[PDB]
Design goal:
This is part of a larger assembly, with chains A, B, C, D, E and F.
Chain A: E1 4-7, E2 19-22, E3 25-28, E4 32-43, E5 46-54, H1 95-103, E6 107-112, E7 129-132, H2 139-147, E8 151-153, H3 155-158, E9 164-170, H4 179-182, E10 224-231, E11 234-235, E12 278-281, E13 294-297, H5 305-308, E14 313-316, H6 333-336, H7 347-361
Antiparallel strand pairs in A: 1-2, 1-14, 3-12, 4-5, 4-6, 4-8, 6-7, 9-10, 9-13, 11-12
Chain E: E1 5-11, H1 13-16, H2 28-36, E2 45-47, H3 49-55, E3 66-75, E4 85-91
Parallel strand pairs in E: 2-4
Antiparallel strand pairs in E: 1-3, 3-4
Chain F: E1 14-15, E2 19-22, E3 30-36, E4 48-49, E5 54-58, E6 71-77, E7 82-83, E8 89-92, E9 96-99, H1 117-122, H2 124-128
Parallel strand pairs in F: 2-9
Antiparallel strand pairs in F: 1-4, 2-3, 3-5, 5-6, 6-9, 7-8
The chains are: A alpha+beta, B alpha+beta, C mainly alpha, D mainly alpha, E alpha+beta, F mainly beta.
Chain A binds two RNA strands through loops.
RNA sequence: GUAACAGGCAAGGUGUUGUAAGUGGUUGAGCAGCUGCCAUACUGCGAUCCACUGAAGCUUAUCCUUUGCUUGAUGAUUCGA
RNA sequence: CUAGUCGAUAGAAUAAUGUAGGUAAGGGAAGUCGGCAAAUUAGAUCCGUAACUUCGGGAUAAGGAUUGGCUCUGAAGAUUG
């Protein structure tokens, strides 16, 4: 999370045409690689996955969901059933399997990697995910998914600015907690024998069992949640060399113009270094460090004027998070503090050994 | 927008501080809590050797 | 090898500094343990195999760096005074001394 | 097995519980050393031996 | 070779952290035994007694943030054991650990 | 009432019953928070006044004609910090209040020290008699 | 992956306390040995203060970064239509 | 310090509730049967001290000021005159 000034664009609230200092969140989204296409039908039981067509080559990063030991293995998935693109197949293998989605199915969802080795973790093993396509006349959906097999799709085409994203992840684990932490129950007095951070009464005499409405020590942390209606403030695109080195309007804007990058001084603490694209939403998605938050498009309508406006942000605070930021760029310290007894007073040894290197050849 | 720390002499980008109003009427921006606490103990900033005011004592 | 429970108790009652301060030679415990009489253990003591391990320095350096500074009054302000003034110098023994002066 | 702690090396036995009973192992090492020693007496090949029938019982409690 | 003697620094506070004081630093002499069996592969870790004298220099609570230790993995001379190798970690007194790049060249 | 626009939630630093300066120049020298003036409440929880939260007051150590009566009052500054909406966190040096009738008109004619902007915006009459708003 | 890697070190970065030991000081209340015939003097005095000095420490153990040094696979148990 | 011990079943890990100890914004008893529990004050020198009283006390009533370090100065004695 990283703290953004902007100028608010309302009707008659009290922040109209004035500044506010908002809290934003940074999701490093390197581009997904779409790798296969699944159809679903309707039954009187619900939907039902019927066909599954994979692209033939898959990254070794992303054949690693299929193994729990990859160092140890012989790397044999998907070695056999990716030869279906190399046999006859034009009467037999796959064109039938794409015929089936045109006719029987009603919902076509698509399977995608995430290139997680661009994220610089120790993880190296991907995240596979079924994304539903939602463009009409499912004859289109099977040709859209037949185009983008094995080819990347990046977050600028999915979302825009000023949309209302949703966040679906896991929360942060706290552990086996107790009752004044799980449920936020009152504390019993200081004169409570045998335990005060309890619920005192656990039920009536009758119904003479305990119910599932009472507050016990039942988990805190690590629950699945979906959170609705976060608003995307910026979509980064942050990598490299469009003609020369390029990071600018990542954390820059039109009122700052120092170009740096969204990552603060000394990195995001425990979280990363971010180099890749990012979605920057309003305040607080769920989870810890390095979670996989999937972002689905909103299910609902937005007519609230808090939901609808477009705001262009004034300033992106790139000061450190690792104790208390004082400066913004690393050359902003040289505005205040010049020569530390460091490579500012170690250059004066480095200049004369290079002069001794100039005195070496002469 | 960018404001000045009253104890030390640093710049305060928006967010980033607490700001004290004495009942003289006067308003004091500090940058850290460390500067804010260290003013209320009346450590004079000419005498603490990491500031700007000590630094303009050269 | 053996336990020198006996051998130590005889050493600290011959040297007459009890066995906090007894050192039996820990490469010669084979030859120390063969020796049972005290007349057989003064021979290990005259020879250098059992030593009396000298006392701890409780040095009196700072004790008399301080009481040369009391002579100039360095540590007697009102925040180093904890007796009532009658306890630090009893006024019954100032008028005893004063009468004997006059 | 109540209330013995759960572990992960007791997956292979297909039961989530299990301990590492040290001196209970080492009295059975010192028995299978003595059962193997009479196996070498009659001339049985010690590497073709399986643990055919093992049982433990009770004794007079002290 | 299998007889190499390697001198290296060890950030101690990184390890005896998360541990309550007055439990370090007889914990810091277990963390050293974990440090050797990850650096020399052996299991029989002998700690030179002067190192123990150095670690208990500032009481049980306080422990030096960083040490400069010298391991020597020698073959087990006698007492024919499963462990043919054993590492002996001795204490190297230095002035400033700064720019003390660990190295293996220790002929002595 | 008279609350213009959205008065955003600030942090309440003055529960029942705290004791505030009576920055008034009426004669009252303390105001004591009997109860605050908007409060539904939930169980066990004490009402508490923010800045510009009118409340119910008694003067405990004041004047003789202001003591032992129940009166309204308005908070003008407090000592627990509060986030203004542009990232600012203001607090003050001590807490203070102002005797007010039921309309929102003050009782005296002077306010001896700064009025926070939150108090001035909702009560224009306290805004007029102010020395230095914010 | 005989090294796409990784662990330990190290170097940066960011932080945090706030100016390290060490010499040197016209910083220093004052007091002395000699204070000298002159030159007019050293300090063994001596809280402090100042320069070298935003120095020095600690800084991932659940911080960030690597063309830096170093290190490495070398087991065990069960399982088919 | 001298003598005397490290003997209290040991290792790993630090969840919940606890027994024991800390700190906590703002408010300060609203809590509670009741300030229970905790918190505050405290040594010493100098000032200063109320109602009432059995004249003895009350009284440490209350209410204030001072205190480190360093370098100095002054006062208090003894034997010989």
């Amino acid at each position: 999370m990283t703290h953004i000034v902007r100028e608010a664009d309302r009707p008659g609230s009290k922040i109209n045409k004035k500044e506010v200092v908002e809290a934003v969140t940074v999701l490093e989204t390197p581009p997904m690689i779409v790798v296969g296409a699944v159809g679903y039908i309707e039954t009187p039981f619900g939907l039902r996955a019927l066909v599954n067509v994979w692209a033939q080559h898959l990254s070794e990063e992303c054949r690693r969901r299929f193994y729990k030991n990859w160092y140890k293995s012989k790397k044999k998935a998907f070695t056999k059933a990716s030869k279906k693109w190399t046999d006859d197949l034009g009467k037999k293998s796959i064109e039938n399997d794409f015929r089936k989605m045109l006719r029987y199915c009603k919902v076509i969802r698509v399977i995608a990697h995430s290139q997680i080795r661009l994220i610089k973790q120790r993880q190296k093993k991907a995240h596979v995910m079924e994304i539903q396509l939602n463009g009409g006349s499912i004859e289109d959906k099977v040709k859209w998914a037949r185009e983008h097999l094995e080819k990347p799709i990046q977050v600028s085409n999915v979302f825009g600015q000023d949309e209302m994203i949703d966040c679906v992840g896991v929360t942060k684990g706290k552990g086996f907690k107790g009752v004044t932490s799980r449920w936020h129950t009152k504390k019993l007095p200081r004169k409570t024998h045998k335990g005060l951070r309890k619920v005192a009464c656990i039920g009536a005499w009758h119904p003479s069992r305990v119910s599932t409405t009472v507050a016990r020590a039942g988990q805190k942390g690590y629950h699945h949640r979906t959170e609705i209606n976060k608003k995307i403030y910026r979509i980064g695109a942050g990598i490299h060399t469009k003609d020369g080195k390029v990071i600018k309007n990542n954390a820059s804007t039109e009122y700052d113009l120092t170009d740096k990058s969204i990552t603060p001084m000394g990195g995001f603490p425990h979280y990363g270094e971010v180099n890749n694209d990012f979605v920057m939403i309003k305040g607080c998605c769920i989870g810890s460090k390095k979670r996989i938050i999937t972002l689905r498009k909103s299910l609902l309508k937005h007519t609230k004027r808090s939901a609808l406006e477009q705001i262009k942000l004034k300033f992106i605070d790139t000061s450190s998070k690792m104790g208390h930021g004082r400066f913004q760029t690393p050359a902003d310290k040289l505005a205040f503090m010049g020569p530390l007894k460091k490579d500012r007073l170690k250059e004066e040894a480095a200049a004369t050994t290079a002069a001794a290197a100039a005195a070496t050849t002469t | 927008k960018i404001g000045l720390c009253a104890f030390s002499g640093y710049k305060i980008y928006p967010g980033h501080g607490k700001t004290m109003v004495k009942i003289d009427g006067k308003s004091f921006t500090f940058l850290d809590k460390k500067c804010e606490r260290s003013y209320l103990m009346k450590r004079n900033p000419r005498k603490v050797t990491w500031t700007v005011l000590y630094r303009r004592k050269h | 090898m053996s336990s020198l429970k006996l051998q130590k108790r005889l050493a600290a009652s011959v040297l007459r500094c009890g066995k906090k301060k007894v050192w039996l030679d820990p490469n010669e415990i084979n030859e120390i343990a063969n020796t049972n009489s005290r007349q057989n253990i003064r021979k290990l003591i005259k020879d250098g195999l059992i030593i009396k391990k000298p006392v701890v320095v409780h040095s009196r350096y700072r004790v008399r760096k301080n009481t040369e500074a009391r002579r100039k009054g360095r540590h007697c302000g009102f925040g180093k005074r904890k007796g009532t003034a009658n306890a630090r110098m009893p006024t019954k023994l100032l008028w005893m001394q004063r009468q004997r002066v006059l | 097995n109540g209330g013995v702690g759960r572990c992960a090396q007791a997956k292979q036995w297909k039961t989530t519980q299990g301990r590492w009973p040290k001196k209970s192992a080492e009295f059975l090492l010192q028995l299978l050393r003595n059962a193997e020693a009479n196996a070498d007496c009659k001339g049985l090949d010690a590497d073709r031996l399986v643990v055919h029938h093992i049982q433990v019982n009770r004794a007079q409690c002290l | 070779n299998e007889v190499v003697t390697r001198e290296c620094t060890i950030h101690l506070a990184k390890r005896v952290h998360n541990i309550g004081f007055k439990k370090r630093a007889p914990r810091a002499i277990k963390e050293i035994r974990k440090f050797a069996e990850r650096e020399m592969g052996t299991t029989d870790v002998r700690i030179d007694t002067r190192l123990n004298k150095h670690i208990w220099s500032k009481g049980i609570r306080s422990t030096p943030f960083r040490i400069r230790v010298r391991l020597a993995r020698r073959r087990n001379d006698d007492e024919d054991s499963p462990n043919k190798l054993y590492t002996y970690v001795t204490y190297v007194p230095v002035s400033t650990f700064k720019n003390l790049q660990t190295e293996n060249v220790e002929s002595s | 009432g008279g609350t213009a626009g959205g008065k955003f939630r600030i942090s309440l630093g003055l529960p029942v019953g705290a004791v505030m300066n009576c920055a008034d120049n009426t004669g009252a020298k303390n105001l004591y928070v009997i109860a605050v003036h908007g409060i539904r409440g939930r169980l066990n929880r004490l009402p508490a006044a923010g800045v510009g939260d009118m409340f119910v007051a008694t003067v405990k150590k004041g004047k003789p004609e202001l003591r032992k009566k129940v009166m309204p009052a308005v908070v003008i500054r407090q000592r627990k910090p509060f986030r203004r909406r542009d990232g600012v966190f203001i607090y003050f040096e001590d807490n203070a209040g102002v005797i007010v009738n039921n309309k929102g008109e003050m009782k005296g004619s002077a306010i001896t020290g700064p009025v926070a902007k939150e108090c001035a915006d909702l009560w224009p009459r306290i805004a007029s008699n102010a020395s230095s708003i914010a």
